[model samples]
Target: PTELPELLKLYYRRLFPYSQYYRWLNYIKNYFQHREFSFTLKDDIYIRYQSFNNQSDLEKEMQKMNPYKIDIGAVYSHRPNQHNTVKLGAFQAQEKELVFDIDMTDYDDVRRCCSDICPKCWTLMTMAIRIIDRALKEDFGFKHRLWVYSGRRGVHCWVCDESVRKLSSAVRSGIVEYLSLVKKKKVHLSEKIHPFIRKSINIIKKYFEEYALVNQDILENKESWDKILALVPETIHDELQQSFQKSHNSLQRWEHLKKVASRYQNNIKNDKYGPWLEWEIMLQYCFPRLDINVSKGINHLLKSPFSVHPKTGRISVPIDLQKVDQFDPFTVPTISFICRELDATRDYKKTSLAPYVKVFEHFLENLDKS
Candidate 1:
């Protein structure tokens, strides 16, 4: 395998999508006039509020600097890097796409990982993408959505509709508030549940049995099983405990719990707490937990798609929504893997970088139509 520095050099010289990248950055209405870019070099040297005049300039600057990481920030009134020259408060942030970030560490209770993710735990990310992708399209009526892996154990979303990019911070906050269900460590379902929350519950319902009951084994252990049982009313707690003991597996135990809850529904009819308890149980275990601040801030920066993660050397490539279920992060093309693949074929005409660029191209083409 090649060393990190050398692999980076090969990546810049051959693998990095110079033309397509410029096309991607320039896809907006004003192109370079409003777009902003940032770079991070080795030793954690940070450069922010960077801007370019044209595609060629952007390409030239990136090739010259060969930054260790790249970040996309909000579009501003004037060039961001040149903001120092502009009058105070004149070069303010004007527009940026609505974005969401989901990290695996947030699921520590269910999946055990800090900085890395196992295959079993990866399903959480998949579930998040599917649910969010559907909401963005069906509920929000916005069509252009770009999903990217964080080059680590998370996912980032870029909703690139012109109207979406221009949404005010308050409006962005409302959207984030609507999407997010967890506040700090607690999950709070609204008193009068919104349609979005109902939609989320529906998504969770589809995967809870397989993901929570079987894969996560949420009820297999006493500590985890007790967490669910504690959420229900005390009156039926003993009944659930006794019923769970008769089931052999988590799935069977979950079914038994539901049946017991249904029987108790007629007895505890004053507040109709039975259905709410079931919804709470499913949501506590399976709903997507978002980084609320990431989606709420228009000025916030997200890691650029195709930028290499310094720790894992994975390319943060654009995700194909059609094949999201098939997106296995472990199988994602790594910098080292691509460089090796680049050499083994040695075609000289087109290298292993073609397929990834194609994915980006397809996404960009759709964005253009939208």
Candidate 2:
């Protein structure tokens, strides 16, 4: 058996899509030279501030280093390699794609699969990509969104619109704030939800039952359901507790919850009490749990697409939103899989990684049109 390290070296040399990647990152002439790339070598030797002059330069370095991981950082005022030579503090961070990181670890309180990504636990990513991706298009009017799997635990979105790239860190933070619905104690949903909130709920409700009640099976356990029911108005607690006993499973219990919530909402005497209860419950269970810092910081470095994850050996590939629901984390190509395909009489396109590279190429083609 060829050891994984040797396999990774082959993967970098032959299989890495240098041309497509260069096209995608090079938003404008000379933009690629200003970008910062960090390489993680063997034994966790982290190298930062590495900048390349052109596509082939990056290719040569990556092939030689076989970095265990790669991180894409912001394009700076000057080339990252010249940080030391430039005037002190004059070299500053510049534009970057407005990026978002949605990881499963954030859902630990809500997810059941302990320390692993499974079909049941994976719906969170699907729901997140759906909700946030739509908002990025419809609400913000940003056109170029490159969604990529994080290989192991989550997904990263790079909003590559030229205008979005120039947004300040404060503006980036504002956008993230607008997308976030989950709050500490106070419910953000009001007597009348905003247009954005309404749209998000529309995306979320489609998966609420299956993701929250069924796959997570939140109602199956009394302890977990206690936390859920506790969010409802105190007036309905005893009744829901008694009514939940009649239902055999999560679906029926959730049906009863809807029934009772509606009945309570229509009661004029209890005006403010029950209006936002259901929204809160659904938001708590299914909302996109973004790592706020990742999106808010313009200078934050995220894992680059097609970089192989050290822990899982899977390549982080571009995700096509048209078939997002069908995409699964566990099924993405791994370092060994692509290496094997290449060594077995391959045409790069004929290999398993071809479809994914095709996806990346398709994204770059669209960018050329506008």
Candidate 3:
């Protein structure tokens, strides 16, 4: 139906070959690779990345801090980019910060933690990343978010900053490991996974075998989806109507759908393509939708189309943030990062723009007190 849903459907089918574990792992890996700049660590695992901030001041303050013991200079280093130096407190008012270098190779365990989604679908894994990003920015002040695409089915995110110096790697790893093991978080995938992986794949395979049915237009002469509802017997139609009722309107329309199904059921019993194409179209029509605005920063690069990586230089699709309506301002459905520097491993969780917003809000509230 629509382009985005169509793309999603196609992508799900393509990824179906992998086991649930592989898919979940791939998604988690992707989450980190495309981090939004804010993070939280528990038991050594990095979770949540909040990214709505567009300011520079909050980025500076997210590092470790202390009002009295300002002279030690931070021994902990968390900058994802610019591994050179970090100034956390004022040593002789000399602009204190910690400086160090770390490589992405040091984070294999972090990548392994992404496998949590193995029991679920890719969508759930993506959702986890979204939630984690939000929590970090609202609760803490870190702001360097790093994102990378793992070679497989996931993402990796890092929130780089001196504040995280207080956290040991073991502690951080333990936290993430706990989150990964929670299988219930991804339960939503079960409902759709059958259709996404099994049904869709079978249907596509049937289409390949029966080449004659590839271009037949079941809709060339039909009116709306309701035109042929009465053909399906009452028993099957009743169940179908009830199941699809949440998505449809008008009993007449439901009746019409039954007719269409009745006519096609006998033909689709073993042949997958015809029914699958129909279902996909219906799914496209019924699913709720979301719109996202492209950021101003990405517009220019997309227009000219540059390399996604050194070897591959494909132009990205141009996006018009202004044209986007029904946007979710509180959440960034998609994000990108321009690596200014690679200080240690830049943290995706810290660079999030959320906590800073709260800080800014509090500052405004306390202006008179100050």
- Count backbone clashes in candidate 1: 0
Give the TM-score (vs. native) of candidate 1: 0.92
Q: What lDDT tens digits, residue by residue, belong to model 2 across residues 96-181?
A: 89999888887787776656789998888898999999999999999988999999989999999999999987898889888888
lDDT of 1 by residue, 145-223 (tens): 8889988898988898878988997898888766676552256454577787788788777777777787778788677
The TM-scores of all predictions, comma-separated, are 0.92, 0.95, 0.22
Q: Give lDDT per model, in order.
A: 0.78, 0.84, 0.27
Better of 1 and 3 by lDDT: 1
Scored by TM-score, the top model is 2
Q: Residue 158 lDDT in model 3?
A: 37
Runs of candidate 1 exceeding 4 Å displacement: 28-30, 112-115, 188-194, 263-274, 348-352
Model 3 stretches with alpha carbons more than 4 Å out:
1-128, 149-153, 184-370
Strongest candidate by lDDT = 2
**Per-candidate count of clashing residue pairs (backbone under 3 Å):** 0, 0, 99
Q: How much is the lDDT of residue 314 in candidate 2?
A: 89
Name the lDDT value of residue 177 in candidate 2.
86
Answer with 1 or 2, whichever has the higher lDDT: 2
| Candidates arranged by lDDT, highest first | 2, 1, 3
